[PDB]
Amino acid sequence: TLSRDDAAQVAKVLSEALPYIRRFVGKTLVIKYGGNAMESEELKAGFARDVVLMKAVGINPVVVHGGGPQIGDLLKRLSIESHFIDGMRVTDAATMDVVEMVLGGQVNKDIVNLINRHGGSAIGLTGKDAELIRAKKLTVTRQEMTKPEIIDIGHVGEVTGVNVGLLNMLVKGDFIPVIAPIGVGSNGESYNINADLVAGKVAEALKAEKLMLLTNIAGLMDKQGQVLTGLSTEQVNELIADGTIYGGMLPKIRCALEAVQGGVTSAHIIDGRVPNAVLLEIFTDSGVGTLISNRK
Amino acid sequence: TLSRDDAAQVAKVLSEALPYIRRFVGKTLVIKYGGNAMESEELKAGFARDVVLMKAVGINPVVVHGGGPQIGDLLKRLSIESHFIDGMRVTDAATMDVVEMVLGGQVNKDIVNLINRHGGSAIGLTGKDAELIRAKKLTVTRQIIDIGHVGEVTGVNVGLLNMLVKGDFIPVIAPIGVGSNGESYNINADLVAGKVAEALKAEKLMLLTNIAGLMDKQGQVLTGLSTEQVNELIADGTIYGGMLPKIRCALEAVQGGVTSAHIIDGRVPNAVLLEIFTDSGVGTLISNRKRH
Amino acid sequence: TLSRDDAAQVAKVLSEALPYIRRFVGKTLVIKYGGNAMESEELKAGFARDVVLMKAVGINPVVVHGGGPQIGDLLKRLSIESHFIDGMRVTDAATMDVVEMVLGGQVNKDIVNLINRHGGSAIGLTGKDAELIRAKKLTVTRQTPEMTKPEIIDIGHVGEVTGVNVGLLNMLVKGDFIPVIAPIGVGSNGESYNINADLVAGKVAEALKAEKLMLLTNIAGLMDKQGQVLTGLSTEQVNELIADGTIYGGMLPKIRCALEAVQGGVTSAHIIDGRVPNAVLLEIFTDSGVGTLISNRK
Amino acid sequence: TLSRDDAAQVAKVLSEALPYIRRFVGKTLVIKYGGNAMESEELKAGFARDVVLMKAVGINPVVVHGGGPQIGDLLKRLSIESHFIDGMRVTDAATMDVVEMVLGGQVNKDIVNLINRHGGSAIGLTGKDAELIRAKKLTVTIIDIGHVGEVTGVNVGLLNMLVKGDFIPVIAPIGVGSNGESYNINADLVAGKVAEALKAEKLMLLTNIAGLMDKQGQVLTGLSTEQVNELIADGTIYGGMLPKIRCALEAVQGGVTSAHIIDGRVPNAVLLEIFTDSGVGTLISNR
Amino acid sequence: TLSRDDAAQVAKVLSEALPYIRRFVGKTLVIKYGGNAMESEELKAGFARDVVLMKAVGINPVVVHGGGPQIGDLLKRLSIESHFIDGMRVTDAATMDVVEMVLGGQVNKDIVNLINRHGGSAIGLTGKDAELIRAKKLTVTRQPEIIDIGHVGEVTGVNVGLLNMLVKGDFIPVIAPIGVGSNGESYNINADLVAGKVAEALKAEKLMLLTNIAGLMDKQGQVLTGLSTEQVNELIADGTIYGGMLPKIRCALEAVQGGVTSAHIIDGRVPNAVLLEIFTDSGVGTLISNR
Amino acid sequence: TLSRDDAAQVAKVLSEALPYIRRFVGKTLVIKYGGNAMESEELKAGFARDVVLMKAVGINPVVVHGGGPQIGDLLKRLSIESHFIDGMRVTDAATMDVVEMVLGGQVNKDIVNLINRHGGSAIGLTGKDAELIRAKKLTVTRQTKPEIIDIGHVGEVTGVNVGLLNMLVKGDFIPVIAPIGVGSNGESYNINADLVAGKVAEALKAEKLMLLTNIAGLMDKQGQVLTGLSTEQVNELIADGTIYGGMLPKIRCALEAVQGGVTSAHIIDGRVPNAVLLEIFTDSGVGTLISNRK
Numbered sequence A: 001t002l003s004r005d006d007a008a009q010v011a012k013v014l015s016e017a018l019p020y021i022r023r024f025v026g027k028t029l030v031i032k033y034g035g036n037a038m039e040s041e042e043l044k045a046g047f048a049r050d051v052v053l054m055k056a057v058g059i060n061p062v063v064v065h066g067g068g069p070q071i072g073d074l075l076k077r078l079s080i081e082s083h084f085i086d087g088m089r090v091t092d093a094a095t096m097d098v099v100e101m102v103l104g105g106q107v108n109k110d111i112v113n114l115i116n117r118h119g120g121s122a123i124g125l126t127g128k129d130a131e132l133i134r135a136k137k138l139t140v141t142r143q144e145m146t147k148p149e150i151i152d153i154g155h156v157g158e159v160t161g162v163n164v165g166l167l168n169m170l171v172k173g174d175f176i177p178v179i180a181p182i183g184v185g186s187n188g189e190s191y192n193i194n195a196d197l198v199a200g201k202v203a204e205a206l207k208a209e210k211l212m213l214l215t216n217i218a219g220l221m222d223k224q225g226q227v228l229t230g231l232s233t234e235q236v237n238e239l240i241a242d243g244t245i246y247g248g249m250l251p252k253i254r255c256a257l258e259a260v261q262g263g264v265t266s267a268h269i270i271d272g273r274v275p276n277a278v279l280l281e282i283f284t285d286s287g288v289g290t291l292i293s294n295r296k
Numbered sequence B: 001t002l003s004r005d006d007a008a009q010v011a012k013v014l015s016e017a018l019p020y021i022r023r024f025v026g027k028t029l030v031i032k033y034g035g036n037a038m039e040s041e042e043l044k045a046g047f048a049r050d051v052v053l054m055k056a057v058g059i060n061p062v063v064v065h066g067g068g069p070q071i072g073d074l075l076k077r078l079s080i081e082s083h084f085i086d087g088m089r090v091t092d093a094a095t096m097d098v099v100e101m102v103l104g105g106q107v108n109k110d111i112v113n114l115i116n117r118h119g120g121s122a123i124g125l126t127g128k129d130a131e132l133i134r135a136k137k138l139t140v141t142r143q144i145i146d147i148g149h150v151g152e153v154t155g156v157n158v159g160l161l162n163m164l165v166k167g168d169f170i171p172v173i174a175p176i177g178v179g180s181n182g183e184s185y186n187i188n189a190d191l192v193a194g195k196v197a198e199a200l201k202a203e204k205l206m207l208l209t210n211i212a213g214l215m216d217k218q219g220q221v222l223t224g225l226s227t228e229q230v231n232e233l234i235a236d237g238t239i240y241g242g243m244l245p246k247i248r249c250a251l252e253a254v255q256g257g258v259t260s261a262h263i264i265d266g267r268v269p270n271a272v273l274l275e276i277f278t279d280s281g282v283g284t285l286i287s288n289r290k291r292h
Numbered sequence C: 001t002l003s004r005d006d007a008a009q010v011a012k013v014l015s016e017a018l019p020y021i022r023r024f025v026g027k028t029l030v031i032k033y034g035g036n037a038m039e040s041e042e043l044k045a046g047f048a049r050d051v052v053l054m055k056a057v058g059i060n061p062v063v064v065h066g067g068g069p070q071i072g073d074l075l076k077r078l079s080i081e082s083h084f085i086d087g088m089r090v091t092d093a094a095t096m097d098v099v100e101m102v103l104g105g106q107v108n109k110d111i112v113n114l115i116n117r118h119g120g121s122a123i124g125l126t127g128k129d130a131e132l133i134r135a136k137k138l139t140v141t142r143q144t145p146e147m148t149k150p151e152i153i154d155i156g157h158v159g160e161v162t163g164v165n166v167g168l169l170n171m172l173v174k175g176d177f178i179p180v181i182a183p184i185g186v187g188s189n190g191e192s193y194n195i196n197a198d199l200v201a202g203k204v205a206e207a208l209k210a211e212k213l214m215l216l217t218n219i220a221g222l223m224d225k226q227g228q229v230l231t232g233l234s235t236e237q238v239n240e241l242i243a244d245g246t247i248y249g250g251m252l253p254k255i256r257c258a259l260e261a262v263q264g265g266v267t268s269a270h271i272i273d274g275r276v277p278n279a280v281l282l283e284i285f286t287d288s289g290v291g292t293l294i295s296n297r298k
Numbered sequence D: 001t002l003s004r005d006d007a008a009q010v011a012k013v014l015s016e017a018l019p020y021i022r023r024f025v026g027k028t029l030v031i032k033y034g035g036n037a038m039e040s041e042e043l044k045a046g047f048a049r050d051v052v053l054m055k056a057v058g059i060n061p062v063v064v065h066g067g068g069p070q071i072g073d074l075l076k077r078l079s080i081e082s083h084f085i086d087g088m089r090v091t092d093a094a095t096m097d098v099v100e101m102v103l104g105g106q107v108n109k110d111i112v113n114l115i116n117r118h119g120g121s122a123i124g125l126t127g128k129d130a131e132l133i134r135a136k137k138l139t140v141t142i143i144d145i146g147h148v149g150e151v152t153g154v155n156v157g158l159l160n161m162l163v164k165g166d167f168i169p170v171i172a173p174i175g176v177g178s179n180g181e182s183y184n185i186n187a188d189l190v191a192g193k194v195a196e197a198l199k200a201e202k203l204m205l206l207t208n209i210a211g212l213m214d215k216q217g218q219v220l221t222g223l224s225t226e227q228v229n230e231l232i233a234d235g236t237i238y239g240g241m242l243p244k245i246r247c248a249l250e251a252v253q254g255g256v257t258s259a260h261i262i263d264g265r266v267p268n269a270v271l272l273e274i275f276t277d278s279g280v281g282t283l284i285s286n287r
Numbered sequence E: 001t002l003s004r005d006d007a008a009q010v011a012k013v014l015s016e017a018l019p020y021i022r023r024f025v026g027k028t029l030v031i032k033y034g035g036n037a038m039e040s041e042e043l044k045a046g047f048a049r050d051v052v053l054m055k056a057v058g059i060n061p062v063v064v065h066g067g068g069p070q071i072g073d074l075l076k077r078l079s080i081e082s083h084f085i086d087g088m089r090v091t092d093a094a095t096m097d098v099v100e101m102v103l104g105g106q107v108n109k110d111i112v113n114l115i116n117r118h119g120g121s122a123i124g125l126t127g128k129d130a131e132l133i134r135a136k137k138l139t140v141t142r143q144p145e146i147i148d149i150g151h152v153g154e155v156t157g158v159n160v161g162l163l164n165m166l167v168k169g170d171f172i173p174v175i176a177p178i179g180v181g182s183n184g185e186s187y188n189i190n191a192d193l194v195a196g197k198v199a200e201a202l203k204a205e206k207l208m209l210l211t212n213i214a215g216l217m218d219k220q221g222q223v224l225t226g227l228s229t230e231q232v233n234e235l236i237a238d239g240t241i242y243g244g245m246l247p248k249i250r251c252a253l254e255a256v257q258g259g260v261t262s263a264h265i266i267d268g269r270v271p272n273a274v275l276l277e278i279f280t281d282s283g284v285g286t287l288i289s290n291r
Numbered sequence F: 001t002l003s004r005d006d007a008a009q010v011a012k013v014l015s016e017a018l019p020y021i022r023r024f025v026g027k028t029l030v031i032k033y034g035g036n037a038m039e040s041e042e043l044k045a046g047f048a049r050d051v052v053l054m055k056a057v058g059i060n061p062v063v064v065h066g067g068g069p070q071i072g073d074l075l076k077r078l079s080i081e082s083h084f085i086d087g088m089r090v091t092d093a094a095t096m097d098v099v100e101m102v103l104g105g106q107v108n109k110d111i112v113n114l115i116n117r118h119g120g121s122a123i124g125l126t127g128k129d130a131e132l133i134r135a136k137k138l139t140v141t142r143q144t145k146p147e148i149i150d151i152g153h154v155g156e157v158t159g160v161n162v163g164l165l166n167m168l169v170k171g172d173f174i175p176v177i178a179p180i181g182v183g184s185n186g187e188s189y190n191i192n193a194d195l196v197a198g199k200v201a202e203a204l205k206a207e208k209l210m211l212l213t214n215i216a217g218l219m220d221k222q223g224q225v226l227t228g229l230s231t232e233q234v235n236e237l238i239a240d241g242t243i244y245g246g247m248l249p250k251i252r253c254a255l256e257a258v259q260g261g262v263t264s265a266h267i268i269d270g271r272v273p274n275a276v277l278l279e280i281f282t283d284s285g286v287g288t289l290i291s292n293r294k
């Protein structure tokens, strides 16, 4: 329900934002949200609105999300403990059930709903749906008494394929795919995957314009606190070895370097806790957060 | 492999099934899966082959499943106590959250993986996906008693359903529905299959149960039944309580556009297949379909 | 820029307005831009970009433009003999040839270039293209007293639209092109005609059964004789506003348009101040119409 | 009854044959029947039905047929007297007009009438409909074999349109050349070219005997060109089987995944090669 | 060879002719061709060309052919010959096998071959093809004792599905008049009847019936035309019509009442005769329509 | 308005025209309107009508035109001096506005009207319509070390919007293109019409590129007409002074078209009534056919 001094400014901005938007109208966008950036409803609902508005403005967004708080609340209630190694939670059987249930039946459907309340049209999907996300088990590793020591963290996996047929069908039908990071193997078994990595692999598969990674923090930092933009593979590795990039940030650049070298103009790590982080990323070109491009 | 004599078997069956397969090619068949029995183990595999094969034979199956074991479990573990009544779970905010997550994330997906593990391409949806099942607070009178968050479908997104079918996918729908404000609703899986079927004007609505079907005073299966016949059949009362809701549902389906509704014994291996691949209709089948 | 402060606004507002916007995703809105004030380079750019946005947001815009003082400039520079009758310029063959060359070869294409400059795909056409706008000489009579036998005065190549090639416009629209039409019609003999851009705009909206017909003007709505913008008028209210003097001059053909337009298939006709920045965006983001909104039942 | 115990079977076996029926679902299958595998109606009809099946199951058949019976009696009635060399009959004018006439307006349209009685929709065609099979005269040994020619090219567009409009092309082996002259061509070679030209999944050669055999009655499979050519100079391969293999080696050499020579006399024959990986007959793959 | 000046001429008369052509751009025209005198060679190629030309110009032609000089000759070489005389040909199971084999395996495939040689894409079709022309027995009454004329039918259906697919793909359907039963027997039918029933089904613009006479003449032997249905039912009473013209006219009437915009009974001896019909607004022969 | 006896003639004429017409049904011919020369009318109408004919008959004509004379009259009336340097027109900012206005608002639309007067459906466009013709500045020099010579807003085609054309053609509309290109920042360029026509046929991989000129075709030093030449022969011919003046750009634009996907390109005498209709409806060795290896 709008007034003449309202529109005066809606229009002034959409109009002054056309150039930025125009750089994606008709191109596809994969947004990764969640994890620790999900914490408050107002932000959850806020993100939904931004995703729709994009659709409203000609972009075709594709959401991939993590779970964060709820996966842990439930696990608590069930009296199951959780541990992560290098940005991957150790997923034994009982845990894999909770994660598969909470991510695809609660979190996933709840984002689908926020988007739909804001006018959009979402389809909540997971790796099992039409084998959206096929995945062999991920062989993890550690090490300086050396030769590779192979770890076993549980039912954790790695993307081997992605049904773009389904994804493309849904987008072209004007729907906003919202995807949980659970994949299926050759035997129909389940695999818990880091939402980042799924976001990456779906973007590559889809050859999108840009992959947004919304997170818990300004962007990727050096141990000194400063956000570092424009890295290339060699810099990242030096930094990981340095003890700089650790925990859940590991799978994060890993997505970005790959998603870019896999067909994606850009991959931008950003603080999603920031009100309208998404809309801001698109209607503007703020030199905020860690950006990784090859865009010629 | 399939030893020579093996494939010849496989052959004359299809070669005998051509008439039937031909009878329902390119049609919607809303199959309510869920028997307190058909969802145990061995019938799980049979239902998937049945559903896939239907598809491969160019038939359009739309599975609508119930919950049950899976929902009961998690509720116990969370030490949550819920009671029933009219065949419907009283449902407060806390358990509506558990019901929705288990149905939409554990049960729904599993049935989908299953179908897929047998060469199918299933898409698991729930009433929230593109507002696929619109609904409202259902009214429980009890000669008004509040049953909680239980409602009745007020509309179905045929748009999206038609698309999946056209893309040659098998929709597996969880019976949760959304209201005008985005509030969740736990709806009975029969009514849903029933309404989804009305909205698509499906050929058949197939409700799987744990009974031989409907029977009369003498235990006989009462099969070739029509809308008015069933109505009279209830006034007189050969149709007892528990079976009523299921039949009042199958009623509205024929009233609403479905032409042949089958009440089936899901305990029987490959029942859906037998109910199609063989024009018998062993069970209870309501309709206004001309014989000759 | 776009501050957090200023996006917090966009969000809460484009949202509540997403319904409004969305209500036009699907059809055509025929817009008549072109005028006197709005011929400024600043006003045209903004408009060009407004039109592109509308396109981005799923609206199919169809522009009909008029105006330009570069028509008179060229007549003078060419020393084309000027002749008037009853205070109107007689548009003879020499004048019509220049009017056509200017509206179709310069104004038309300049708008087309601005639209393309901001991301749209504009096609510049006149009534000659595939006979987009068929026309016939318009019969004019000198102003006289009521009781006196009217006199037909020949003011030249001035016409009236007898038909529109919707096939052409439907094709272009469907291919994601923004038609940009010059108000020049063709007659049975291939002769040209200069038609009031408002009337052309209105015939084009009717032919396409457009959702909206927007007539941008330079006065911010149809005012009542005391200075107030009026809205949601019906034929009776317009018939008496004219009868008593408040509607006059060029505001006359404009409502006659709207009215006809709406009586002929357009769902709503908006008469707005085209001088206001983002003017056209403003009539689609709120059912709140800044200015006159004619809708015969809505 | 589909009964109890015989349904649990029907299920586990229909299921397990599903992956196999799948390697062909989108792909095209050229089926050459005819020949002397055609001999009885009863049987012949079962073939038609066997075809409608592959079609209800979402497989795309393209039938190429020959003649034996019908081309024999009419050539007999009219006093002609047919002659043969290396699997190909020596066709002169009255012989060509008769072959073109029989194969095209009798044999061909009748199979089409069969496939239609069992549900599917078939269009009877010859190399002349839209110049479907283009041809020059065959270069062989000089042997005035007469009006026998080769396949210059196939109207694949006509075929792809029909197939995807849901029809079954039934193709008589008659070819046409630049000037519009008929040429009689072996139904085998036609099928092999119509398969190469469509890049079909597999070429099915239904014959009279089960698989190309050696002088000892021993069936062979997986034969490569070097050895097969030893088998022709030898005496081992002769008559009708001469064009049969060569059309098979070519189809593989040029596009078709595989090509299988089986016993068309066996009821449900075709189905068996699909619903299984039988291992019987003479299958030609590519290594 | 349009030399110099002629170029100047054709440009003028082609333009005139364009609007007449436009009428029929996009339209379907079912044409009945097969006959007696028409069976000249020189003249057959002219029809093939005319049809390709119609295709180039934007019109979609559908060809229905009859003609059996080619049958009598095979029957003969096989010493089976019989008598028929009453519009239709009394077909025993034997003559039928031959009728169906020469009609759809020789005659038909040749009209296809010609059109093809001239730049067309023709498809030879009989009623057996996808049950293109569904049929049944017949009931011929002696002028009521029934005269046995089975293996001869009444058209009871037309797969328009197929014809549409062929047209849309820019093919020229060429259909031999053989009907197929609900069981699969062939019945031998009359071209004009097939053509008209094929016209009705496609709701064509025109049914063109190539005869061997300038059109429907009257008492004084003057060409008739541009009249209506009720009008034509009239002159039948006048008893003006006779022979194999009677049904040719009943073919059209129905066709017209059956949706078809207009029917033309024209002399198919005249070269480019069919084109004369689409180029001149009027109709150069006898034109039945009633809109 | 119909004839009868000459309905029979149209029949006989198109009947025999089929072998040739058939060659191009469904193919697009990029025709550059020229030889217009004396601004006749029986000749401008003749062309318009030949183009509609080709369309009726199933051919897909695309037209490209110039307008030197017309630009010249206007510049003259506005008292703006005119200058040509090596065939291209020196185009300062003021000349560009006049060039663009006349070619796209007058000459262009007038051919459209003519084609429509004869039955066609023509669309008049310039490079600025949906960036139909993308261009950049052309670099010109001279050997009075060459020196760069600024001759104004004269560009060279950098790209064509086939999307728009294909759509137009498929809708049974005949595109009429004025040779004005657009730059990166929206500047307007004035391009040789032969060159634009060449780039368009290339982009469209056209069956034929027809250049109607005012002469007969490419000729010897003795006035004879050369036909079906190779890219190697055209070089020896320009190399000895056989080809010069405006004929140079013409042929160079013709080879390019062929070395870029156009089947055949011909230089034709556009002064001959129905010049178009004859290079199709018949087959004469009249003109200069350039096909490389065909």
Ligand SMILES: Nc1ncnc2c1ncn2[C@@H]1O[C@H](COP(=O)(O)OP(=O)(O)O)[C@@H](O)[C@H]1O
Pocket: A034, A035, A036, A037, A066, A068, A087, A196, A214, A215, A216, A217, A219, A220, A221, A222, A223, A244, A245, A246, A247, A248, A249, A250
């Ligand atoms: N170099 C680094 N720069 C920034 N954050 C880092 C870095 N190394 C590790 N991190 C960790 O990554 C976290 C965000 O990743 P994560 O916990 O996986 O959540 P999510 O993927 O759900 O957004 C930060 O809260 C921080 O503790």
Ligand SMILES: Nc1ncnc2c1ncn2[C@@H]1O[C@H](COP(=O)(O)OP(=O)(O)O)[C@@H](O)[C@H]1O
Pocket: C035, C036, C217, C218, C219, C221, C222, C223, C224, C225, C246, C247, C248, C249, C250, C251, C252
């Ligand atoms: N009731 C009225 N309300 C508003 N404007 C009116 C009214 N009656 C007449 N006008 C005149 O209409 C003019 C605007 O339209 P028009 O005459 O077509 O000129 P322009 O080309 O500047 O738009 C106003 O400048 C005003 O003088």
Ligand SMILES: Nc1ncnc2c1ncn2[C@@H]1O[C@H](COP(=O)(O)OP(=O)(O)O)[C@@H](O)[C@H]1O
Pocket: D034, D035, D036, D037, D066, D087, D206, D207, D208, D209, D211, D212, D213, D214, D236, D237, D238, D239, D240, D241, D242, D244
């Ligand atoms: N080496 C061989 N192995 C098997 N069959 C052979 C061989 N050489 C010749 N044949 C003959 O080839 C026949 C099949 O080919 P052909 O006579 O042309 O009939 P069809 O056209 O029905 O295939 C068999 O019936 C058999 O008599």
Ligand SMILES: Nc1ncnc2c1ncn2[C@@H]1O[C@H](COP(=O)(O)OP(=O)(O)O)[C@@H](O)[C@H]1O
Pocket: E035, E036, E210, E211, E212, E213, E215, E216, E217, E218, E240, E241, E242, E243, E244, E245, E246
């Ligand atoms: N009123 C009539 N007007 C014109 N021709 C007629 C009329 N009545 C009968 N006919 C005869 O009908 C003939 C055409 O029918 P028919 O002899 O059966 O041959 P076909 O079917 O081979 O064209 C004309 O050649 C003419 O002799």
Ligand SMILES: Nc1ncnc2c1ncn2[C@@H]1O[C@H](COP(=O)(O)OP(=O)(O)O)[C@@H](O)[C@H]1O
Pocket: F034, F035, F212, F213, F214, F215, F217, F218, F219, F220, F242, F243, F244, F245, F246, F247, F248, F250
């Ligand atoms: N070998 C040549 N063959 C043909 N024309 C030539 C030759 N050398 C030069 N010309 C000149 O090129 C002219 C054609 O090009 P041009 O003057 O640009 O005119 P247009 O392209 O407008 O018809 C001919 O009229 C002729 O005077």
Ligand SMILES: CC(=O)N[C@@H](CCC(=O)O)C(=O)O
Pocket: A034, A035, A065, A066, A067, A068, A071, A087, A088, A089, A099, A156, A157, A181, A192, A193, A194, A195, A196
């Ligand atoms: C394997 C794995 O670590 N998975 C993630 C998936 C959710 C996410 O990325 O937030 C996890 O927390 O369990």
Ligand SMILES: CC(=O)N[C@@H](CCC(=O)O)C(=O)O
Pocket: B034, B065, B066, B067, B068, B071, B087, B088, B089, B099, B150, B175, B186, B187, B188, B189, B190
């Ligand atoms: C309301 C209600 O009873 N819901 C059902 C839905 C699942 C079903 O039918 O199995 C329930 O168990 O909670």
Ligand SMILES: CC(=O)N[C@@H](CCC(=O)O)C(=O)O
Pocket: D034, D035, D065, D066, D067, D068, D071, D087, D088, D089, D099, D148, D173, D184, D185, D186, D187, D188
């Ligand atoms: C040339 C030639 O041999 N033709 C084969 C065609 C039929 C077939 O292969 O069965 C023939 O017997 O006449």
Ligand SMILES: CC(=O)N[C@@H](CCC(=O)O)C(=O)O
Pocket: E034, E065, E066, E067, E068, E087, E088, E089, E099, E152, E177, E188, E189, E190, E191, E192
């Ligand atoms: C029954 C009947 O009319 N038969 C015709 C069919 C051929 C035709 O009309 O040309 C016949 O000669 O046998």
Ligand SMILES: CC(=O)N[C@@H](CCC(=O)O)C(=O)O
Pocket: F065, F066, F067, F068, F071, F087, F088, F089, F091, F099, F154, F179, F190, F191, F192, F193, F194
């Ligand atoms: C640059 C240039 O040559 N311009 C030409 C364009 C006209 C044409 O090609 O006909 C000119 O006179 O201005």
Ligand SMILES: [Cl-]
Pocket: A221
């Ligand atoms: Cl840190």
Ligand SMILES: [Cl-]
Pocket: C223
């Ligand atoms: Cl005022």
Ligand SMILES: [Cl-]
Pocket: F219
């Ligand atoms: Cl010279």
Ligand SMILES: [Mg+2]
Pocket: A035, A066, A087, A194, A196, A248
């Ligand atoms: Mg993480």
Ligand SMILES: [Mg+2]
Pocket: C250
């Ligand atoms: Mg005014």
Ligand SMILES: [Mg+2]
Pocket: D035, D066, D087, D186, D187, D188, D240
């Ligand atoms: Mg053989």
